[PDB]
Ligand binder design. Structure first.
Ligand SMILES: *CCC(=O)N1C[C@@H]2[C@H](C1)[C@@H](c1cccc(Cl)c1)C[C@H]2Oc1ccc(NC(C)=O)cc1
Ligand SMILES: C[S@@+](CC[C@H](N)C(=O)[O-])C[C@H]1O[C@@H](n2cnc3c(N)ncnc32)[C@H](O)[C@@H]1O
Lengths: 207, 119
Protein backbone atom coordinates (compact mmCIF):
# COMPACT_ATOMS: atom_id res chain seq x y z
CA UNK A 1 0.00 0.00 0.00
CA UNK A 2 1.50 3.32 -1.16
CA UNK A 3 0.14 6.32 0.74
CA UNK A 4 -0.48 9.64 -1.03
CA UNK A 5 2.51 11.50 0.48
CA UNK A 6 4.83 8.58 -0.25
CA UNK A 7 3.65 8.48 -3.87
CA UNK A 8 4.16 12.24 -4.28
CA UNK A 9 7.65 11.96 -2.69
CA UNK A 10 8.63 9.29 -5.19
CA UNK A 11 7.28 11.31 -8.11
CA UNK A 12 9.44 14.29 -7.02
CA UNK A 13 12.43 12.03 -7.89
CA UNK A 14 11.42 11.70 -11.56
CA UNK A 15 13.85 13.81 -13.63
CA UNK A 16 12.43 16.25 -16.14
CA UNK A 17 13.18 17.36 -19.68
CA UNK A 18 16.78 18.26 -20.54
CA UNK A 19 15.83 20.83 -23.18
CA UNK A 20 12.06 21.13 -23.18
CA UNK A 21 10.52 21.81 -26.59
CA UNK A 22 8.14 24.72 -26.28
CA UNK A 23 6.18 23.83 -29.44
CA UNK A 24 5.31 20.43 -27.94
CA UNK A 25 4.29 21.93 -24.56
CA UNK A 26 6.94 19.93 -22.72
CA UNK A 27 6.72 20.19 -18.93
CA UNK A 28 6.57 17.29 -16.44
CA UNK A 29 3.24 16.55 -14.83
CA UNK A 30 3.65 18.29 -11.46
CA UNK A 31 4.20 15.85 -8.56
CA UNK A 32 1.20 16.90 -6.49
CA UNK A 33 -1.05 16.75 -9.60
CA UNK A 34 0.20 13.33 -10.60
CA UNK A 35 0.01 11.90 -7.08
CA UNK A 36 -3.55 12.99 -6.43
CA UNK A 37 -4.68 11.92 -9.92
CA UNK A 38 -3.09 8.42 -9.78
CA UNK A 39 -4.04 7.84 -6.13
CA UNK A 40 -7.68 8.48 -7.08
CA UNK A 41 -7.53 6.31 -10.20
CA UNK A 42 -6.20 3.43 -8.09
CA UNK A 43 -8.01 3.78 -4.76
CA UNK A 44 -11.37 5.19 -5.88
CA UNK A 45 -11.84 3.52 -9.27
CA UNK A 46 -9.45 0.53 -9.26
CA UNK A 47 -8.39 1.38 -12.84
CA UNK A 48 -4.62 0.62 -12.51
CA UNK A 49 -3.80 -2.59 -10.58
CA UNK A 50 -3.50 -5.63 -12.84
CA UNK A 51 -4.41 -3.47 -15.85
CA UNK A 52 -2.71 -2.51 -19.10
CA UNK A 53 -2.53 1.25 -19.19
CA UNK A 54 -1.54 3.79 -21.88
CA UNK A 55 -0.06 7.20 -21.03
CA UNK A 56 -0.51 9.55 -24.02
CA UNK A 57 2.08 12.32 -24.24
CA UNK A 58 4.05 10.51 -21.57
CA UNK A 59 7.02 12.91 -21.64
CA UNK A 60 9.64 12.21 -19.07
CA UNK A 61 7.27 9.68 -17.53
CA UNK A 62 5.83 11.01 -14.29
CA UNK A 63 2.34 9.53 -14.79
CA UNK A 64 3.68 6.22 -16.12
CA UNK A 65 6.24 5.85 -13.33
CA UNK A 66 3.50 6.33 -10.76
CA UNK A 67 1.13 3.95 -12.57
CA UNK A 68 3.82 1.24 -12.67
CA UNK A 69 4.35 1.57 -8.87
CA UNK A 70 0.61 1.12 -8.21
CA UNK A 71 0.48 -2.40 -9.58
CA UNK A 72 -0.19 -2.01 -13.35
CA UNK A 73 0.55 -5.19 -15.32
CA UNK A 74 2.05 -2.95 -18.03
CA UNK A 75 2.09 0.78 -18.64
CA UNK A 76 2.94 1.90 -22.18
CA UNK A 77 3.90 5.53 -22.68
CA UNK A 78 3.51 7.22 -26.07
CA UNK A 79 5.22 10.50 -27.06
CA UNK A 80 6.24 12.17 -30.35
CA UNK A 81 9.69 13.21 -29.04
CA UNK A 82 12.61 10.83 -28.85
CA UNK A 83 14.49 13.07 -26.41
CA UNK A 84 11.62 12.85 -23.89
CA UNK A 85 11.49 9.10 -24.24
CA UNK A 86 15.24 8.76 -23.62
CA UNK A 87 14.74 10.52 -20.29
CA UNK A 88 11.72 8.40 -19.48
CA UNK A 89 13.71 5.24 -20.13
CA UNK A 90 16.43 6.52 -17.80
CA UNK A 91 13.89 7.31 -15.12
CA UNK A 92 12.26 3.83 -15.38
CA UNK A 93 15.69 2.19 -15.10
CA UNK A 94 16.58 4.34 -12.04
CA UNK A 95 13.33 3.32 -10.28
CA UNK A 96 13.94 -0.32 -11.30
CA UNK A 97 10.47 -0.43 -12.96
CA UNK A 98 10.27 -3.11 -15.65
CA UNK A 99 6.47 -3.18 -16.13
CA UNK A 100 6.89 -0.20 -18.51
CA UNK A 101 7.31 0.16 -22.27
CA UNK A 102 7.32 3.18 -24.54
CA UNK A 103 6.61 4.09 -28.14
CA UNK A 104 7.45 7.07 -30.34
CA UNK A 105 4.42 8.21 -32.34
CA UNK A 106 2.03 11.04 -33.09
CA UNK A 107 -1.05 10.49 -30.90
CA UNK A 108 -3.13 12.67 -33.26
CA UNK A 109 -2.56 10.18 -36.12
CA UNK A 110 -3.54 6.93 -34.38
CA UNK A 111 -6.91 6.37 -36.16
CA UNK A 112 -7.82 2.64 -36.00
CA UNK A 113 -4.58 1.78 -34.17
CA UNK A 114 -4.67 -0.21 -30.94
CA UNK A 115 -8.47 -0.05 -30.90
CA UNK A 116 -9.80 -1.12 -27.52
CA UNK A 117 -6.34 -2.53 -26.68
CA UNK A 118 -5.95 -0.82 -23.26
CA UNK A 119 -8.00 -0.98 -20.04
CA UNK A 120 -7.24 2.58 -19.03
CA UNK A 121 -5.72 5.65 -20.74
CA UNK A 122 -4.23 8.50 -18.69
CA UNK A 123 -2.78 11.78 -19.99
CA UNK A 124 -1.75 15.38 -19.34
CA UNK A 125 -2.12 16.56 -22.96
CA UNK A 126 -0.97 19.71 -24.77
CA UNK A 127 -3.56 22.46 -25.33
CA UNK A 128 -2.33 24.21 -28.49
CA UNK A 129 -4.69 24.64 -31.45
CA UNK A 130 -4.26 21.79 -33.99
CA UNK A 131 -6.50 21.95 -37.04
CA UNK A 132 -9.16 24.20 -35.48
CA UNK A 133 -9.44 22.35 -32.12
CA UNK A 134 -7.40 21.89 -28.96
CA UNK A 135 -4.67 19.26 -29.23
CA UNK A 136 -6.19 17.87 -26.00
CA UNK A 137 -9.42 17.10 -27.92
CA UNK A 138 -7.46 15.16 -30.57
CA UNK A 139 -5.74 13.26 -27.74
CA UNK A 140 -9.18 12.57 -26.24
CA UNK A 141 -10.56 11.15 -29.43
CA UNK A 142 -7.59 8.79 -29.66
CA UNK A 143 -7.79 7.89 -25.96
CA UNK A 144 -11.45 6.92 -26.16
CA UNK A 145 -10.76 4.69 -29.18
CA UNK A 146 -7.89 2.95 -27.34
CA UNK A 147 -9.51 2.51 -23.94
CA UNK A 148 -11.96 -0.21 -22.96
CA UNK A 149 -12.96 1.02 -19.50
CA UNK A 150 -11.82 4.55 -18.68
CA UNK A 151 -9.89 7.66 -19.76
CA UNK A 152 -8.47 10.11 -17.21
CA UNK A 153 -7.30 13.49 -18.52
CA UNK A 154 -6.60 17.10 -17.61
CA UNK A 155 -8.45 19.77 -19.62
CA UNK A 156 -8.58 23.53 -19.14
CA UNK A 157 -11.50 24.37 -16.82
CA UNK A 158 -12.30 27.22 -19.26
CA UNK A 159 -13.17 24.60 -21.91
CA UNK A 160 -15.45 22.51 -19.64
CA UNK A 161 -18.69 23.17 -21.50
CA UNK A 162 -17.07 22.25 -24.83
CA UNK A 163 -15.74 18.99 -23.40
CA UNK A 164 -19.19 18.21 -21.94
CA UNK A 165 -20.81 18.87 -25.33
CA UNK A 166 -18.43 16.57 -27.19
CA UNK A 167 -18.89 13.80 -24.62
CA UNK A 168 -22.66 14.02 -25.14
CA UNK A 169 -22.27 13.91 -28.94
CA UNK A 170 -19.99 10.85 -28.55
CA UNK A 171 -22.33 9.11 -26.03
CA UNK A 172 -19.46 9.05 -23.49
CA UNK A 173 -20.09 9.35 -19.76
CA UNK A 174 -18.22 12.31 -18.29
CA UNK A 175 -17.46 13.08 -14.64
CA UNK A 176 -15.51 16.11 -13.47
CA UNK A 177 -13.68 14.65 -10.45
CA UNK A 178 -11.43 17.59 -9.36
CA UNK A 179 -10.60 21.26 -10.05
CA UNK A 180 -6.84 21.73 -9.91
CA UNK A 181 -4.25 24.39 -10.52
CA UNK A 182 -0.58 24.15 -11.35
CA UNK A 183 2.23 26.35 -12.63
CA UNK A 184 3.18 26.48 -16.27
CA UNK A 185 6.86 27.07 -17.13
CA UNK A 186 7.78 30.72 -16.49
CA UNK A 187 8.67 31.16 -20.14
CA UNK A 188 5.00 30.53 -21.08
CA UNK A 189 3.97 33.91 -19.54
CA UNK A 190 4.35 36.02 -22.69
CA UNK A 191 1.87 38.88 -21.95
CA UNK A 192 1.54 41.04 -18.82
CA UNK A 193 -1.66 39.67 -17.22
CA UNK A 194 -1.27 36.06 -18.40
CA UNK A 195 -1.51 33.85 -15.30
CA UNK A 196 1.60 31.85 -14.36
CA UNK A 197 -0.65 28.90 -13.60
CA UNK A 198 -3.44 27.05 -15.33
CA UNK A 199 -6.82 25.90 -14.00
CA UNK A 200 -7.62 22.37 -15.13
CA UNK A 201 -10.32 19.78 -14.56
CA UNK A 202 -9.39 16.17 -13.85
CA UNK A 203 -12.04 14.32 -15.87
CA UNK A 204 -13.00 10.64 -15.96
CA UNK A 205 -14.55 9.46 -19.23
CA UNK A 206 -16.25 6.08 -19.41
CA UNK A 207 -18.64 4.05 -21.49
CA UNK B 1 9.72 -3.52 -26.79
CA UNK B 2 8.06 -6.50 -25.11
CA UNK B 3 5.99 -9.05 -27.05
CA UNK B 4 2.77 -7.99 -25.31
CA UNK B 5 3.50 -4.43 -26.55
CA UNK B 6 4.13 -5.77 -30.11
CA UNK B 7 0.78 -7.57 -29.89
CA UNK B 8 -1.11 -4.41 -28.90
CA UNK B 9 0.66 -2.29 -31.52
CA UNK B 10 -0.19 -4.89 -34.14
CA UNK B 11 -3.80 -5.50 -33.09
CA UNK B 12 -7.13 -5.18 -34.82
CA UNK B 13 -10.60 -6.00 -33.51
CA UNK B 14 -11.85 -9.03 -35.45
CA UNK B 15 -15.38 -8.54 -36.75
CA UNK B 16 -17.40 -8.78 -39.96
CA UNK B 17 -14.86 -6.83 -42.01
CA UNK B 18 -11.65 -8.14 -43.52
CA UNK B 19 -8.71 -9.30 -41.44
CA UNK B 20 -6.06 -6.78 -40.39
CA UNK B 21 -2.39 -7.73 -40.34
CA UNK B 22 0.28 -7.37 -37.63
CA UNK B 23 3.60 -5.58 -37.85
CA UNK B 24 6.29 -8.04 -38.86
CA UNK B 25 9.05 -8.09 -36.23
CA UNK B 26 12.77 -8.57 -36.89
CA UNK B 27 15.37 -8.15 -34.19
CA UNK B 28 19.13 -7.69 -34.14
CA UNK B 29 19.45 -7.25 -30.37
CA UNK B 30 17.31 -8.82 -27.63
CA UNK B 31 17.70 -8.73 -23.85
CA UNK B 32 16.05 -10.67 -21.04
CA UNK B 33 14.55 -8.41 -18.37
CA UNK B 34 12.92 -9.91 -15.25
CA UNK B 35 9.50 -8.46 -14.46
CA UNK B 36 7.71 -9.19 -11.23
CA UNK B 37 5.22 -11.98 -11.96
CA UNK B 38 1.60 -10.86 -11.77
CA UNK B 39 -0.45 -14.05 -12.47
CA UNK B 40 -3.74 -12.15 -12.19
CA UNK B 41 -2.57 -9.81 -14.96
CA UNK B 42 -1.22 -12.55 -17.19
CA UNK B 43 -4.46 -14.55 -16.90
CA UNK B 44 -6.43 -11.42 -17.89
CA UNK B 45 -4.17 -10.95 -20.91
CA UNK B 46 -4.39 -14.55 -22.27
CA UNK B 47 -7.77 -14.08 -24.12
CA UNK B 48 -6.61 -10.70 -25.47
CA UNK B 49 -3.48 -11.99 -27.22
CA UNK B 50 -3.66 -12.32 -30.97
CA UNK B 51 -2.02 -15.74 -31.04
CA UNK B 52 -0.93 -15.96 -34.69
CA UNK B 53 0.90 -12.62 -34.43
CA UNK B 54 2.49 -13.63 -31.10
CA UNK B 55 3.70 -16.96 -32.55
CA UNK B 56 5.24 -15.27 -35.63
CA UNK B 57 7.04 -12.68 -33.50
CA UNK B 58 8.24 -15.26 -30.95
CA UNK B 59 9.61 -17.44 -33.77
CA UNK B 60 11.48 -14.45 -35.20
CA UNK B 61 13.13 -13.94 -31.79
CA UNK B 62 14.21 -17.64 -31.79
CA UNK B 63 11.96 -18.47 -28.84
CA UNK B 64 11.18 -22.18 -28.48
CA UNK B 65 8.48 -24.52 -27.18
CA UNK B 66 6.08 -21.57 -27.41
CA UNK B 67 2.53 -22.52 -26.33
CA UNK B 68 0.45 -22.79 -29.52
CA UNK B 69 -2.68 -21.30 -27.87
CA UNK B 70 -4.55 -21.10 -24.47
CA UNK B 71 -4.29 -24.36 -22.51
CA UNK B 72 -6.96 -26.32 -20.68
CA UNK B 73 -7.69 -24.66 -17.32
CA UNK B 74 -5.11 -21.93 -17.90
CA UNK B 75 -6.12 -19.65 -14.97
CA UNK B 76 -5.17 -22.56 -12.66
CA UNK B 77 -2.07 -23.56 -14.68
CA UNK B 78 0.76 -21.68 -12.90
CA UNK B 79 3.37 -23.14 -15.27
CA UNK B 80 1.54 -21.86 -18.39
CA UNK B 81 1.01 -18.43 -16.77
CA UNK B 82 4.70 -18.26 -15.75
CA UNK B 83 5.79 -19.28 -19.29
CA UNK B 84 3.51 -16.71 -20.91
CA UNK B 85 4.69 -14.04 -18.43
CA UNK B 86 8.24 -14.65 -19.57
CA UNK B 87 7.49 -14.71 -23.30
CA UNK B 88 5.11 -11.68 -23.23
CA UNK B 89 6.92 -9.40 -20.76
CA UNK B 90 10.56 -10.47 -20.19
CA UNK B 91 11.90 -10.85 -23.75
CA UNK B 92 12.71 -7.31 -24.90
CA UNK B 93 13.60 -6.24 -28.42
CA UNK B 94 16.27 -3.56 -28.13
CA UNK B 95 17.29 -3.15 -31.78
CA UNK B 96 15.03 -4.25 -34.58
CA UNK B 97 12.29 -3.32 -37.06
CA UNK B 98 8.54 -3.45 -37.44
CA UNK B 99 7.39 -3.81 -41.02
CA UNK B 100 4.08 -2.31 -42.09
CA UNK B 101 2.03 -4.90 -44.06
CA UNK B 102 0.23 -2.34 -46.25
CA UNK B 103 3.38 -0.40 -47.35
CA UNK B 104 6.39 -2.62 -46.66
CA UNK B 105 8.00 0.32 -44.80
CA UNK B 106 10.38 -0.45 -41.88
CA UNK B 107 9.79 1.31 -38.59
CA UNK B 108 12.94 1.06 -36.42
CA UNK B 109 13.12 -0.15 -32.83
CA UNK B 110 16.13 1.42 -31.11
CA UNK B 111 17.05 1.34 -27.41
CA UNK B 112 13.90 -0.72 -26.98
CA UNK B 113 11.61 1.99 -28.45
CA UNK B 114 9.67 1.60 -31.70
CA UNK B 115 9.61 4.83 -33.76
CA UNK B 116 6.28 4.76 -35.61
CA UNK B 117 6.60 8.22 -37.26
CA UNK B 118 6.62 8.70 -41.06
CA UNK B 119 9.91 10.59 -40.97
C1 LIG C 1 1.35 -0.06 -41.36
C2 LIG C 1 1.98 0.91 -40.40
C3 LIG C 1 1.80 2.34 -40.83
O1 LIG C 1 1.24 2.64 -41.86
N1 LIG C 1 2.14 3.37 -40.04
C4 LIG C 1 1.76 4.77 -40.24
C5 LIG C 1 2.02 5.46 -38.89
C6 LIG C 1 2.24 4.30 -37.92
C7 LIG C 1 2.81 3.16 -38.75
C8 LIG C 1 0.83 4.03 -37.39
C9 LIG C 1 0.82 3.20 -36.12
C10 LIG C 1 0.46 1.85 -36.16
C11 LIG C 1 0.46 1.10 -35.00
C12 LIG C 1 0.88 1.64 -33.80
C13 LIG C 1 1.23 2.97 -33.75
CL1 LIG C 1 1.82 3.66 -32.25
C14 LIG C 1 1.26 3.73 -34.90
C15 LIG C 1 0.22 5.43 -37.25
C16 LIG C 1 0.84 6.28 -38.35
O2 LIG C 1 1.28 7.49 -37.65
C17 LIG C 1 1.88 8.51 -38.36
C18 LIG C 1 2.73 9.35 -37.66
C19 LIG C 1 3.35 10.40 -38.32
C20 LIG C 1 3.02 10.69 -39.64
N2 LIG C 1 3.66 11.77 -40.29
C21 LIG C 1 4.92 12.23 -40.09
C22 LIG C 1 5.29 13.43 -40.94
O3 LIG C 1 5.75 11.65 -39.35
C23 LIG C 1 2.15 9.86 -40.32
C24 LIG C 1 1.55 8.77 -39.68
C1 LIG D 1 2.59 18.49 -20.50
S1 LIG D 1 3.65 17.38 -21.43
C2 LIG D 1 3.07 15.81 -20.65
C3 LIG D 1 3.70 15.56 -19.34
C4 LIG D 1 4.05 14.11 -19.04
N1 LIG D 1 2.92 13.43 -18.37
C5 LIG D 1 5.30 14.12 -18.16
O1 LIG D 1 5.15 13.79 -16.96
O2 LIG D 1 6.40 14.49 -18.71
C6 LIG D 1 2.91 17.07 -23.05
C7 LIG D 1 3.65 15.98 -23.80
O3 LIG D 1 3.00 15.77 -25.07
C8 LIG D 1 3.98 15.40 -26.03
N2 LIG D 1 3.37 15.60 -27.35
C9 LIG D 1 3.03 16.81 -27.94
N3 LIG D 1 2.37 16.66 -29.06
C10 LIG D 1 2.29 15.28 -29.24
C11 LIG D 1 1.71 14.45 -30.23
N4 LIG D 1 1.06 14.89 -31.30
N5 LIG D 1 1.78 13.11 -30.08
C12 LIG D 1 2.42 12.63 -29.02
N6 LIG D 1 3.02 13.30 -28.04
C13 LIG D 1 2.90 14.63 -28.19
C14 LIG D 1 5.16 16.28 -25.66
O4 LIG D 1 6.34 15.86 -26.31
C15 LIG D 1 5.11 16.25 -24.13
O5 LIG D 1 6.02 15.30 -23.57
Amino acid sequence: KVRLKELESRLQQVDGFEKPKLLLEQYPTRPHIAACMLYTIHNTYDDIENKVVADLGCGCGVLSIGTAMLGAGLCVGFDIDEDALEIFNRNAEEFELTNIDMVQCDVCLLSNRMSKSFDTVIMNPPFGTKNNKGTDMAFLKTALEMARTAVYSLHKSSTREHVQKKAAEWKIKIDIIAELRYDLPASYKFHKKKSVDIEVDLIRFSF
Amino acid sequence: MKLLTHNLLSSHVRGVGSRGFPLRLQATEVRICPVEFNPNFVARMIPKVEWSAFLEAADNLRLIQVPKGPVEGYEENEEFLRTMHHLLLEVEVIEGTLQCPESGRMFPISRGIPNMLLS
